[PDB]
Amino acid sequence: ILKRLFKEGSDVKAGQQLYQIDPATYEADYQSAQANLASTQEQAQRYKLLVA
Amino acid sequence: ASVATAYLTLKADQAQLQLTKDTLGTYQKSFDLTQRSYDVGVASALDLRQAQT
Structure with a gap:
């Protein structure tokens, strides 16, 4: 994993990326x-x- | 005999002329297609020079 992109505990849109393997x-x-x-x-x- | 051979060679040589005109037509069509394929890029310029010769 190079980068974590979501703010933890936040509402997530369908199709938003989360990580970068x-x-x-x-x-x-x-x-x-x-x-x-x-x-x-x-x-x-x-x-x-x-x-x- | 000489007038007969002259007329027979005249008929046969104009038939030869017609067949060489038809071969010239087919070679011209083949060079037309090679110039068409040369503009697009499939055929190199070596095939274009061979068709031109």
């Missing part, structure tokens, strides 16, 4: 997925514009 080994999967998304959008866009 370490996003280290998960931001490195988001970049690995976002890179392949940025490469495979280009196949779809190039071929969608080029099938015409």
